[PDB]
Amino acid sequence: AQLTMIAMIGIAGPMIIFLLAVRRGNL
Amino acid sequence: SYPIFTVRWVAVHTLAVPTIFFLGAIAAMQFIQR
Amino acid sequence: ANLWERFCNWVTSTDNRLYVGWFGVIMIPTLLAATICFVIAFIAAPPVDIDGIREPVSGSLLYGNNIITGAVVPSSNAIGLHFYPIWEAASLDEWLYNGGPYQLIIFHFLLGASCYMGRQWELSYRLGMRPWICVAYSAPLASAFAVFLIYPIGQGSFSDGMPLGISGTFNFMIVFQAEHNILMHPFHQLGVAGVFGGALFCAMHGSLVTSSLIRETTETESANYGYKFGQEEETYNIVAAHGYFGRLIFQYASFNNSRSLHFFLAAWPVVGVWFTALGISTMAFNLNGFNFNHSVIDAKGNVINTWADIINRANLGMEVMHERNAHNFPLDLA
Amino acid sequence: GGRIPLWIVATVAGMGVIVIVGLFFYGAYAGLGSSL
Amino acid sequence: ATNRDQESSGFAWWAGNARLINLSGKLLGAHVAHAGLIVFWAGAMTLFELAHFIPEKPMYEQGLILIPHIATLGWGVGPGGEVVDTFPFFVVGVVHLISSAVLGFGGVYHAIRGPETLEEYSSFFGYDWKDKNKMTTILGFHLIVLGIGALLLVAKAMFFGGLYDTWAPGGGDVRVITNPTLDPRVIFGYLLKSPFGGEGWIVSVNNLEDVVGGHIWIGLICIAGGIWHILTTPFGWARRAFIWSGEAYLSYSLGALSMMGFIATCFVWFNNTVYPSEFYGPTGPEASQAQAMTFLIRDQKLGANVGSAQGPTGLGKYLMRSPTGEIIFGGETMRFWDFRGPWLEPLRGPNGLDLNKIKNDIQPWQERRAAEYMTHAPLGSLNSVGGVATEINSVNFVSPRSWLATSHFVLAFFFLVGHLWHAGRARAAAAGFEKGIDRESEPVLSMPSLD
Amino acid sequence: MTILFQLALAALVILSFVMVIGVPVAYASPQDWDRSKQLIFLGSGLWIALVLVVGVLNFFVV
Amino acid sequence: GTTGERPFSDIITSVRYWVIHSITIPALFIAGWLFVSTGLAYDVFGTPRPDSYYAQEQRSIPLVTDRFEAKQQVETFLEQLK
Amino acid sequence: KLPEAYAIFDPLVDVLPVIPVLFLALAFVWQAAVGFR
Amino acid sequence: RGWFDILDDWLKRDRFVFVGWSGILLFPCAYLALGGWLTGTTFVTSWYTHGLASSYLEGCNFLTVAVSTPANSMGHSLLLLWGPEAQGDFTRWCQLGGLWTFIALHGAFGLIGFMLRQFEIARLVGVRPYNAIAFSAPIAVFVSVFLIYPLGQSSWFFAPSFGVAAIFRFLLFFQGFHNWTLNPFHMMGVAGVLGGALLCAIHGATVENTLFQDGEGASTFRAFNPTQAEETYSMVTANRFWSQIFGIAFSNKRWLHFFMLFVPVTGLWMSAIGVVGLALNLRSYDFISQEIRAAEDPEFETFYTKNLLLNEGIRAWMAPQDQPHENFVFPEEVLPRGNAL
Ligand code: CLA
Ligand code: CLA
Ligand code: CLA
Ligand code: CLA
Ligand code: CLA
Ligand SMILES: CC1=C(/C=C/C(C)=C/C=C/C(C)=C/C=C/C=C(C)/C=C/C=C(C)/C=C/C2=C(C)CCCC2(C)C)C(C)(C)CCC1
Ligand SMILES: CC1=C(/C=C/C(C)=C/C=C/C(C)=C/C=C/C=C(C)/C=C/C=C(C)/C=C/C2=C(C)CCCC2(C)C)C(C)(C)CCC1
Ligand SMILES: CC1=C(/C=C/C(C)=C/C=C/C(C)=C/C=C/C=C(C)/C=C/C=C(C)/C=C/C2=C(C)CCCC2(C)C)C(C)(C)CCC1
Ligand SMILES: CC1=C(/C=C/C(C)=C/C=C/C(C)=C/C=C/C=C(C)/C=C/C=C(C)/C=C/C2=C(C)CCCC2(C)C)C(C)(C)CCC1
Ligand SMILES: CCCCCCCCCCCCO[C@@H]1O[C@H](CO)[C@@H](O[C@H]2O[C@H](CO)[C@@H](O)[C@H](O)[C@H]2O)[C@H](O)[C@H]1O
Ligand SMILES: CCCCCCCCCCCCCCCCCC(=O)O
Ligand code: OEX
Ligand SMILES: [Cl-]
Ligand SMILES: [Cl-]
Ligand SMILES: [Fe+2]
């Protein structure tokens, strides 16, 4: 359970970066 | 146009391949019980 | 100009052979006091009851020491962290017996060395330089603070400060290992990395510059005369030095930028020494090195020794023997 | 060539190294060498 | 992407946050986001501690540092520091966490989407670092806020539950403070006390009346000073004394915070009033004194005449005299004779430890407490093996006092390094040579030679 | 109301995850600034409402 | 200047590199894992298992004490384990 | 221990404390995405 | 062209990792030393030579793993895999400590190869050989500590074992048995190492704080070009600063950088000489005058005598487990101990 929760918390950040990169965001 | 296999390739792999092998071994050791 | 204006101009003058500055106004008297007291005490002070058990330790040359064994002995454990100036004693005889010179010396020295750091900043400002040489100096200064003030504060007594002597320093080190396992503490390991690497990089940089000196002299003359103080052009070929070192390891492991190189030279040892100073200053509050004593056990439960257990045997020898008459109860809690 | 971005490669590789080191510390507290 | 590259800002990525010096909107966003980080850690860590909390076991056996802070304020605990209700702990955690979410939203907004500079949108919130009047106005606002915080502590102590008093008659209890110390002689004599042994400067404050009175004075002084700095502008001597720039203000604050970190280190190491031993464990001096007391008790029970027991060195084995004559525990713990604690003070008379009281009036609770503290002295390894370095594995214990003292000494020192770095750089940048020496006007070349 | 309270809290957690991902993406995506603004406002309001609903119901379960 | 080898960044950001290594790296890692979990490492290197440091009632270490008989001494210790 | 109602979230609470460190790492991930310009 | 010249061409090709003739010696030996260390620390025990666990497979951690020295009964045997001890049995070789001599020998020859690499590359690119000359200090340290010292002692057993904690044990053994800290050659080594660190830090900081402004950036690194002819920092300003702060200062850059070479190298060489002495138990252990005085006068005490008591404790408490071949049994009553501890 803890491993799954931390995996989600930890993919979230790079996920934001990846979405803004795919979307030509104001990075 | 680049060659694939070079002296640099040999050096890199002589270090890299055993490193992954050993890391697998140590990971497995983490689950040994006395 | 008025008298005060003239005095300020003299104090801050960049034309004095030795800069004084406002930090210097504190540094000069305090360092002179510390130096004079240290020299006199090292030569002539009588034995000091360091551990407060009426067992004076002889530190001075005239009382049977040589250069290697001599020391200014820390103040008595009976004093603890109490402030013990000369005027707090009934007589100089009492002051000496209880080890007042140590307090006078270390306090004046710590204050003066802090002012020395500030003076480095101040003169850089007067000369129009960048300001961070004092930041480099903060590493050894922090180490001095750790061994002379912080560790005594944490342990409750100036008697546990580092003695002002060579063999005394060794005693401090051995007892520290017995009580804190400093060798197994990551901050001291970082300190060793800092100083080994500092020496390594010192040798590397010196050797690379010396190997890339440009020919300006003959074989009968020292190559050092090929450089003239204040000359505009560089005296060695950094491009050649980089070609050599990059081929020694590989291209991207070698600096081609002199500014980056010198920043790295500054940063490695300075950070290492900061961390080792923090190691002493944190073991002052009894957060000790790693303890793996009996960590490896077999199926039945037998202890399988490791090199850490061997270290522990050595530490036990030190612990049981140190300050052999001072402990009355089973645990050494400070 | 540059099909897979280098920042993604670096992030993923760092995550892998972190996971390996963390597992090793978990081992410090479990199994052999745990003192228990 | 205004000013978000080295070419346009002059700063490399590893110094990127310097790019914000003159972008007040993004800088406000940065500060609000970081404050969100602080509040978020408070909440998450408190919840972690509560989830791992075993109420029966002492707090200091469980690696707790925040729950003790809450308990010291009188929340959740009863006589002797026993935990009667953990819901206050849970509430503290949850509220700080939700607030952290709000702060994060605000910081992200001001840093990413809001106006990059506040000067055009508003002159009340916009500022110029060289505008001394506006700078002192913001300083005064925050002074008023801080004074309110101090008075909030006073209110908790006086009107909402009180504080946990380890010195309360009966063995430590939550007590409402009704007679705070308003005597300026006392309050500021604390500041005038020597920091050396047996004096301890402000670290020696040993009663909640003095604590509450001091915080009353702090709150009032802060409110008055904040009003002062809102209504005034710096005088000429100050204008000529200081460097007036953002980096200079940052450096001043770094120096102040470093000082406060060192002071906090000493506070948590030595003081057992605002850090009750019931929650933080014994101090080092306390544990050493406790060992002395424990073995005095054992040997006396066996029949020893402890007052007359001569040790190997000639000093009393159990009791001796301090350099000013007070009767004190013997052995190495002679250095800790300034220690004071509720389990020990009943044995002390005008001349120090009293032989008749030691012989006749030591109570079982005192014996138990001495054993407990002796066996939970603040000594342990980095991997949390309790005891001296030579001890074997078995006890999983490092004292909260050790954790807190070490952490905050590290922080205080590195913040001193920060003060030096940013103060030196502020001076050099104000004078105009922080980027190096001008080749065509090298100052030293125009100076006379030293010799 | 045990499972009801657990469901409300789980919804709070999931909505927090969605907001934590979405708010920065929307803010740094200037193109998507018509629908995303309404989405963010509605999500903030619902998050506050859920926080209150939890807290109120905390005293009706345990 | 470069010596003509393909750039590392170019290699590690390429699809073919990862097509190859998404197979090779896991295979080697699993090979090491199995080397340990099947017990072959103990046999290869002569390392005692947790239950093979001592005989059941033994507490003395099996130290080698003769240079030219050391191999046979170790074999005798191993037999005494049985 | 947490109040009984909240026991199901215990694994999440167990991991919450490290998120600030995750933020520090996120700064480097972002700078990598922008090439440390 | 002849085959020798063709081979020289290929060996000296410009490639990512230079090979050279020295490479034929360096690369196999360095690889074997490093690989042997990793292999031993991962999988190999010290049970039959020391009575110790020393590998990850047994449960040690990075601080406690080691490739431990062979048993004392092996003497100074080379312990070749095909030698009369292991007799070609790889498992028995590992159990007998052949990995220690394997690592030590392949590492020594690797150091030879690396120094030859320094010479070869310097000659090819046309620089002076001072990096190779400075490398003599690490080689002297390695030879003195890992070969000469054990060769003077009873066997390889007392050489340092290749590990973190094992090296720490080596330090404490030298203190307890040799009083190594009292040795003026170690003292000169300490001066060399700490002074080298001091020079490194002070020179780096001085350069970085006497830079010329050669660009508009607040990050000053981009304002240097490797091909530029001008000095990047002001020697005149640095000299003035240190003259006024410390009294003396460098005025010749060539002397400055040679001194940076000289200090650490000389210090390490001095330490090596001291260790050669210790190989024969030729210690700076005592001061005879102090011992005579202390023997006759029970009130005379110095930090020297205190440290001797510490050494006696170390010896008595660590010998039985650190030297298992001696079969020491020290009854509890004979162990030196102070009061109450
Ligand atoms: C209130 C505190 C504070 C504030 C607001 C600032 C603000 C600033 N500083 Mg100062 N600084 C501070 C404290 C502070 N500093 C302290 C305490 C030190 C001493 C160490 C310094 C030393 C310092 C230097 C040397 C420099 C600055 C610079 C700067 C600027 C850019 C910073 C940046 O982009 O960092 C970017 C951040 C990073 C690159 C990350 C660094 C991460 C650190 C080193 C490690 C942290 C480890 C962590 C705590 C634990 C990790 C766990 C792990 C081991 C598992 C900015 C104006 C720069 C400047 O002059 O600009 C004008 C500059 O060169 N600062
Ligand atoms: C507490 C830490 C901290 C904070 C608050 C900031 C804040 C800031 N930095 Mg700094 N920085 C930091 C650490 C920090 N930094 C470190 C450690 C480094 C070294 C790697 C840097 C290096 C650096 C550089 C080099 C630059 C900045 C810049 C900036 C500013 C603009 C950022 C931007 O354009 O984002 C763009 C990024 C994105 C759009 C990606 C998404 C970012 C969002 C905020 C993630 C938030 C996630 C969060 C979970 C959302 C919760 C929402 C929920 C509450 C609803 C901003 C005020 C820039 C600046 O000053 O510009 C003028 C700039 O150029 N920073
Ligand atoms: C010290 C922190 C701080 C500061 C100085 C500012 C300042 C500003 N913000 Mg920002 N903001 C903050 C925090 C902060 N904000 C936070 C945390 C959030 C998230 C909720 C926001 C969300 C936000 C938005 C969405 C907008 C602003 C806007 C503005 C501007 C107009 C504000 C105004 O007119 O106030 C009006 C005053 C009030 C509404 C009353 C506030 C009083 C509060 C509610 C209670 C009392 C204060 C008390 C001390 C709070 C204690 C909290 C403590 C626990 C930390 C101004 C430049 C606006 C802007 O940039 O316009 C272009 C805008 O659109 N802010
Ligand atoms: C966050 C707190 C804070 C800060 C940063 C400032 C900052 C400032 N104040 Mg304000 N002030 C504050 C709180 C604060 N104040 C409060 C709470 C009050 C109400 C009592 C005042 C009342 C006040 C007045 C009445 C005046 C200022 C003035 C000033 C300016 C000059 C300060 C100065 O020279 O200090 C440096 C201090 C000195 C040069 C004198 C004392 C220096 C001694 C020798 C140092 C002693 C250190 C000590 C021995 C070492 C140990 C410390 C230990 C005792 C804690 C400056 C802008 C002056 C100004 O221009 O305002 C218009 C002014 O006249 N302040
Ligand atoms: C330059 C590379 C190099 C060098 C210098 C060494 C050096 C060494 N190795 Mg290492 N080794 C290497 C590469 C190298 N090795 C490689 C690549 C491997 C992996 C295959 C090994 C595997 C290895 C193992 C497994 C062991 C060593 C050992 C040794 C040591 C003993 C060697 C010995 O006695 O050889 C003697 C051999 C010669 C001197 C060669 C002489 C060649 C002449 C021309 C022969 C002339 C007569 C001959 C009969 C020719 C007949 C011709 C005709 C009749 C057909 C020594 C320190 C041993 C060790 O460390 O012990 C602790 C050990 O057990 N090595
Ligand atoms: C700007 C920037 C930055 C920064 C950022 C930040 C710092 C942010 C922050 C943020 C934040 C600070 C956030 C927060 C969040 C929060 C949240 C989201 C919360 C939530 C909560 C909840 C949901 C809860 C729940 C619960 C309860 C209520 C009870 C108990 C249980 C539980 C826990 C479940 C960086 C560095 C990246 C870089 C770039 C720029
Ligand atoms: C709460 C409390 C209390 C109280 C407290 C108080 C009351 C406090 C106060 C405090 C204070 C009241 C403080 C002050 C401080 C100050 C300072 C810290 C200052 C500093 C200064 C400076 C830094 C300066 C500088 C300079 C110089 C010197 C020269 C010229 C230049 C300049 C300006 C730069 C008590 C203890 C009772 C109890 C407990 C609680
Ligand atoms: C309270 C709460 C919450 C919140 C959360 C959050 C707020 C999160 C955040 C998150 C985050 C904030 C994340 C982050 C992450 C990060 C990471 C994962 C990083 C990593 C990094 C790395 C790995 C790096 C690497 C590298 C690079 C990039 C470049 C250079 C090189 C190197 C390798 C260093 C939730 C919703 C759960 C709900 C419940 C409650
Ligand atoms: C001895 C011998 C031999 C050889 C062998 C070899 C050659 C081996 C090698 C091996 C190897 C080659 C191995 C390797 C391994 C590796 C490892 C095991 C690694 C680890 C790593 C780590 C753990 C790291 C970590 C980290 C950190 C912590 C932070 C930063 C990042 C990093 C990632 C770095 C032969 C066959 C001749 C036979 C005879 C004997
Ligand atoms: C123990 C407490 C000590 C600190 C107390 C707080 C004092 C704060 C107010 C004192 C103000 C001092 O005021 C300050 O005096 C000095 C010295 O005359 C003036 O100094 C000025 O004149 C002198 C001549 O005497 C010149 O050398 C100097 O270059 C010039 O700046 C400053 O311009 C003024 O700002
Ligand atoms: C100078 C170059 C040295 C190279 C040496 C390579 C060593 C390779 C040895 C591998 C075979 C070992 C022989 C094993 C059988 C020997 C048994 C025996 O008869 O004693
Ligand atoms: O004085 Mn010097 O050393 Ca610190 O621990 Mn306790 O007190 Mn004593 O015993 Mn171990
Ligand atoms: Cl001693
Ligand atoms: Cl004692
Ligand atoms: Fe140089």
Coordinates of N, CA and C in Angstrom, one line a residue, chain I residues 156-210:
Chain I
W156 N 51.0 -11.8 5.7 CA 50.1 -10.9 5.1 C 48.9 -10.6 6.0
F157 N 48.6 -11.4 7.0 CA 47.5 -11.3 7.9 C 47.4 -9.9 8.5
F158 N 48.6 -9.3 8.8 CA 48.6 -8.0 9.5 C 48.7 -6.8 8.6
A159 N 48.7 -7.0 7.2 CA 48.5 -5.9 6.3 C 47.1 -5.4 6.4
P160 N 46.8 -4.2 5.9 CA 45.4 -3.8 5.9 C 44.5 -4.7 5.1
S161 N 43.3 -5.0 5.6 CA 42.3 -5.7 4.8 C 41.6 -4.6 4.0
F162 N 41.2 -5.0 2.7 CA 40.6 -4.0 1.8 C 39.2 -3.8 2.2
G163 N 38.9 -2.8 3.1 CA 37.6 -2.5 3.5 C 37.6 -1.2 4.4
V164 N 36.4 -0.6 4.5 CA 36.3 0.6 5.3 C 36.6 0.3 6.7
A165 N 35.8 -0.5 7.3 CA 35.9 -0.8 8.8 C 37.3 -1.5 9.0
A166 N 37.7 -2.3 8.1 CA 39.0 -3.0 8.2 C 40.1 -2.0 8.3
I167 N 40.1 -0.9 7.4 CA 41.1 0.1 7.5 C 41.0 0.9 8.8
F168 N 39.8 1.1 9.3 CA 39.7 1.7 10.7 C 40.3 0.9 11.7
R169 N 40.1 -0.4 11.7 CA 40.8 -1.3 12.6 C 42.3 -1.2 12.4
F170 N 42.8 -1.1 11.2 CA 44.2 -0.9 11.0 C 44.7 0.4 11.7
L171 N 44.0 1.5 11.6 CA 44.4 2.7 12.3 C 44.5 2.4 13.8
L172 N 43.5 1.8 14.4 CA 43.4 1.7 15.8 C 44.5 0.7 16.3
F173 N 44.8 -0.4 15.5 CA 45.9 -1.3 15.8 C 47.2 -0.5 15.8
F174 N 47.4 0.4 14.8 CA 48.7 1.1 14.8 C 48.8 2.0 16.0
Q175 N 47.7 2.6 16.5 CA 47.8 3.4 17.7 C 48.1 2.5 18.9
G176 N 47.4 1.4 19.0 CA 47.5 0.6 20.3 C 48.9 0.0 20.4
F177 N 49.4 -0.6 19.3 CA 50.6 -1.4 19.3 C 51.8 -0.6 18.9
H178 N 51.7 0.4 18.0 CA 52.9 1.1 17.6 C 53.0 2.5 18.1
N179 N 52.0 3.0 18.8 CA 51.9 4.5 19.2 C 52.3 5.3 18.0
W180 N 51.6 5.0 16.9 CA 51.9 5.6 15.6 C 51.8 7.2 15.6
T181 N 50.8 7.7 16.4 CA 50.7 9.1 16.4 C 51.9 9.9 17.0
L182 N 52.7 9.2 17.8 CA 53.9 9.8 18.4 C 55.1 9.8 17.4
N183 N 54.9 9.3 16.2 CA 56.0 9.1 15.3 C 56.2 10.3 14.4
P184 N 57.4 10.9 14.5 CA 57.6 12.2 13.8 C 57.4 12.1 12.3
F185 N 57.5 10.9 11.7 CA 57.3 10.7 10.3 C 55.8 10.7 9.9
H186 N 55.0 10.1 10.8 CA 53.5 10.3 10.6 C 53.2 11.8 10.8
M187 N 53.8 12.5 11.8 CA 53.5 13.9 12.0 C 53.8 14.7 10.8
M188 N 54.9 14.5 10.1 CA 55.2 15.2 8.9 C 54.2 14.8 7.8
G189 N 53.8 13.5 7.7 CA 52.8 13.2 6.8 C 51.5 14.0 7.0
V190 N 51.1 14.1 8.3 CA 49.9 14.9 8.7 C 50.0 16.3 8.2
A191 N 51.2 16.9 8.5 CA 51.5 18.2 8.1 C 51.3 18.4 6.5
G192 N 51.8 17.4 5.8 CA 51.7 17.4 4.4 C 50.3 17.4 3.9
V193 N 49.5 16.5 4.4 CA 48.1 16.3 4.0 C 47.3 17.5 4.4
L194 N 47.3 17.9 5.6 CA 46.5 19.1 6.0 C 47.0 20.4 5.4
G195 N 48.3 20.6 5.2 CA 48.8 21.7 4.5 C 48.4 21.7 3.0
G196 N 48.4 20.5 2.4 CA 47.9 20.4 1.1 C 46.5 20.8 0.9
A197 N 45.6 20.4 1.9 CA 44.2 20.8 1.8 C 44.1 22.3 2.0
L198 N 44.9 22.8 2.9 CA 44.9 24.3 3.2 C 45.3 25.1 1.9
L199 N 46.4 24.6 1.3 CA 46.8 25.3 0.0 C 45.7 25.2 -1.1
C200 N 45.2 24.0 -1.2 CA 44.1 23.8 -2.2 C 43.0 24.8 -2.0
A201 N 42.5 24.9 -0.7 CA 41.4 25.8 -0.4 C 41.7 27.2 -0.6
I202 N 42.9 27.6 -0.1 CA 43.2 29.0 0.0 C 43.5 29.5 -1.4
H203 N 44.2 28.7 -2.3 CA 44.4 29.1 -3.6 C 43.2 29.2 -4.5
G204 N 42.3 28.2 -4.4 CA 41.0 28.3 -5.1 C 40.3 29.5 -4.7
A205 N 40.1 29.8 -3.4 CA 39.4 30.9 -3.0 C 40.0 32.2 -3.4
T206 N 41.3 32.3 -3.3 CA 42.0 33.6 -3.7 C 41.8 33.9 -5.2
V207 N 42.0 32.8 -6.0 CA 41.7 33.1 -7.5 C 40.3 33.5 -7.7
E208 N 39.3 32.8 -7.1 CA 37.9 33.1 -7.3 C 37.6 34.5 -6.8
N209 N 38.3 35.1 -5.8 CA 38.0 36.4 -5.3 C 38.9 37.5 -5.7
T210 N 39.9 37.2 -6.6 CA 40.6 38.2 -7.3 C 40.5 38.2 -8.8

